[PDB]
Amino acid sequence: CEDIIQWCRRRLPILDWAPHYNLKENLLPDTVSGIMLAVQQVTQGLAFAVLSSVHPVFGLYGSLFPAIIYAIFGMGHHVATGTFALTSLISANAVERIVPQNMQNLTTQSNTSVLGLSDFEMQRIHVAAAVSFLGGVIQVAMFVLQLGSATFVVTEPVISAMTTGAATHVVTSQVKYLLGMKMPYISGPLGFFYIYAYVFENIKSVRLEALLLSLLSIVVLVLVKELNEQFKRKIKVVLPVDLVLIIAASFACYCTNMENTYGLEVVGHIPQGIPSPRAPPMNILSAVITEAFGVALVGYVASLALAQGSAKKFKYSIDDNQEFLAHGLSNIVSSFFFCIPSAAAMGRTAGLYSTGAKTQVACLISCIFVLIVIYAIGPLLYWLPMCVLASIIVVGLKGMLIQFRDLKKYWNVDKIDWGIWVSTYVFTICFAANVGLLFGVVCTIAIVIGRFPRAMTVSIKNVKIISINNPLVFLNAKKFYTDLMNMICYLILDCSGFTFFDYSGVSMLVEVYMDCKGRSVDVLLAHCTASLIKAMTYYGNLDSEKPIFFESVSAAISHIHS
Amino acid sequence: CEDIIQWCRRRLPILDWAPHYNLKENLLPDTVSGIMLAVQQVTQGLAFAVLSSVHPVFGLYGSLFPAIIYAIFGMGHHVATGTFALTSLISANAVERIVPQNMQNLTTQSNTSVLGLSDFEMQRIHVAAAVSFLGGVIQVAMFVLQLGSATFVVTEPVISAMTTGAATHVVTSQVKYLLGMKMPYISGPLGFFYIYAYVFENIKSVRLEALLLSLLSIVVLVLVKELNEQFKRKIKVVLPVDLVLIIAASFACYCTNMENTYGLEVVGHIPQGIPSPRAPPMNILSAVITEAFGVALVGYVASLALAQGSAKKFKYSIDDNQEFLAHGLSNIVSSFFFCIPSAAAMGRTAGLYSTGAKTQVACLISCIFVLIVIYAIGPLLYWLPMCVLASIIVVGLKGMLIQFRDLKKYWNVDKIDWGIWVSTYVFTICFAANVGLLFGVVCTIAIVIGRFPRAMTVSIKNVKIISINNPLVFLNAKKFYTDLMNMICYLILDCSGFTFFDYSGVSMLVEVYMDCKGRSVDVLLAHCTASLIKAMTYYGNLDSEKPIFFESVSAAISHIHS
Ligand SMILES: [I-]
Ligand SMILES: [I-]
Ligand SMILES: [I-]
Ligand SMILES: [I-]
Prior knowledge:
By secondary structure, the first copy, chain A, is mostly helical. Chain A has helices spanning 2-10, 14-17, 28-51, 57-61, 65-73, 85-98, 122-144, 156-173, 175-179, 191-201, 208-230, 241-254, 289-314, 322-335, 346-355, 361-375, 386-396, 398-401, 406-413, 417-430, 433-449, 477-486, 503-518, 531-539, 553-560, and strands at residues 81-82, 343-344, 458-461, 465-468, 492-494. Chain A contains 25 helices and 5 strands. Chains A, B: Keywords: Anion exchange, Cell membrane, Disease variant, Endosome, Ion transport, Membrane, Transmembrane, Transmembrane helix, Transport. Chains A, B: Pfam families: STAS, Sulfate_transp.
């Protein structure tokens, strides 16, 4: 049928922009954006595969396949799917719990040892792929039963606080690389403070060379990135400072013995790869349920925020339910190619904004470059120090960390969203990002619920006319009663603003009617829609041959003159 | 201070009705109600202490102390605290899990064997007392932080469905006594069907004498109780059919060997009691957390419903937070006297209505009679068959079971509360009463939340005037936008019905203003309270020297004429 064809065409938004592509003004900016995004995605993939307690080579795969799937199935134009450290910090818990460090040695190194990797490295990527697969199927299920229409519960302050707290957590997790020391996997309901306790207790074990390298890299990156923004009118491009820093650090670590003399840590091997696809270990799909739910929700909300921001900024329309399908398909297809959970990072979107990308082609061209890294520039990334990579990551987290300035706006506007922001931030700092999101949503719903029984439900208009403003539900059913008995020969209830109700509202309206009848004051109603009339005539046994319901306030006023 | 004194006086409502008592028209009906309630409380205490997997003598204690404490600390007039089978069915789970049947034999019978009971009987009453104590402290804590104001979330259909399902469960639990067979403790997420599966698989083990006795008792009870109400005008009293049935059954079981010849089951010993108070075992207070929460919530909700019904019927005012304190104190004080969890049953309230009780004195006089049962009529309750007791209980459950007629009203009024009723009933039948209550509350909140983004948010009134009906929160912030852009030189937003908002509402209002400015249509506002003006001027950078906010619609109309 025609409707079936329309439905099928609505699930592939690429056909909306592929034939309409213009190679006269949407090619050069898209190409430049792709080149500038390739290095960002490569560095983020490496640093967030190390953050996910898997081999760094798998973050490179995480920057290739989900981007293609989202380009085919995604609605947002400036959304670049990838590694997204927020989900890596969640999958690391499952990876470290199922496969702890005590099985590091005495391995096989053969018997389906994919790539050139040793054993105990496939045991961890298998758990990560299982987490990705379960998160993808959860997202697809949430697409089937249309929960994308229920995304209004996640408000702006909750997402802002959760992302700021997660940025602080990611900054904390990179501290050991900037300092140069080694720490065990510390996680839990208060790991943020335990990490710094460990750092301060072992302050004599830090390496000065790593500290100076990280400080120099951070200073140079911040200086170049802040000087380029202010001089945008003169310099009409974006300076690739990250690429220059990576090349300089690698060349300085190679034309020395800085891996041996001044004991440093570098990115290990990165073998040339893309092996044959393999199904994830469905045996583990029962022990990673909570991590799968956490990634499937956190990644979706963080990516939907970016998609909605892009749609608002560039004046186009997106669907909150198509993002569910796009992200679920990305995760499911990626889990077969040894990929960690994927989502959209705000830094890549900000880079796309600053470069001038137009369509999803900029997110595809970068993939073409990532392939080149897999097969050609793979072994070349041996001498990049982890201090420089950590400096790059913490400088790129600036957009997420700068969201502390929303506190002034929330204080000057609401002062109730200010408290929600602060509570969500402290919960995200203490426990985690998913706990922070859940707490924020629950707190928002509870606050909005506890504000109906303490708000004015009627308005007196200048026989007296009383207009019913808000809908009459169980939330403000009793408050309505005491609102109407407090404002007491005739009475007109203008029900034009009375849209929807329930059993409690109808029962309370009938109770008000009978109580006013008992106190020798008549109650004439108004528009009252058409279902309200039926409900009130059934509940109150109201006879149809008595004038109670009128078509307008003027009709009731005319009925008074009789 | 005077406020402290008034606060302390508000916590003892007995002083509100003790000195104002009138022993002219509030004594004879109160005395008759007390006499007619004593036998009801005795039978329910016995049959609900057996239902709680403890000795039947402890249900007699459960009908004595919480009644006194609620009389001192309670607001409702026709509320009689006691055993309340709904809470017994919850505490039985803890009793049977902590102390299962396999240690019934090989006991000590000494070393602080209270009263004359064997051991393994104190082991169960200790667990029940711990459950009641923890529930009481939970209720007192819920009184401290004033959660009694947040009781509007529990609606009438949820309570009705939960009570009907629990009544069906209680009818199921008494089936073995009516039939005469014996069953092991069956409970779980589908125990209601497993009980009947056991009954049908062992249909050859039922006792005919017990079945005929139960059928005769049920028929006589129903006949007398339905003939008495319909001849209320002639018979100006309530016939004590339960007392006559108990005496007749006991006397016909004594002047025969019906405990031996036609093998029956009778009430065991009922020793003369009221022992010394003893603190409940605090070692167990960690294994009964869920049962304590279940009783503390179900009992409070089912008793608050009755208190509110009484207040509405007899035109007085109660406090939803004082009931928390009264019930918590009742449970805590009763836990020291070997009592099972306590609450208010609907049958006792219906009996109080039908007798003519006026104050809480009718709930105290019965206590005086219960004392007589403890010390004098204790051993006399040996030959009462369990078939007659089960018949009495299932006939008394008529008020709870008749609530199926609310389905017609809910169908003819709402059709959305009808679905909530049905869903809560089926969940209560499947799992339990507490699960049913939780599901009902969550379903009500979810349905009410889902109904905001699909309701009309504005109303055009006959330049064009558009009145803002509902509050602008995150629930209907987006729906408002598309509601106002769809209805599009001048535009007036009558903000009289606009009462409370949040960040999302203010941001959406400012977005509508800017978009209308871009489309060359001016937006003039209205009353707009006083904080809305500040929020809109801050968020939108609105200058105070431009006419945007007016005091009334007529002022805006006058501004047009310029
Ligand atoms: I990120
Ligand atoms: I996190
Ligand atoms: I009951
Ligand atoms: I139950």
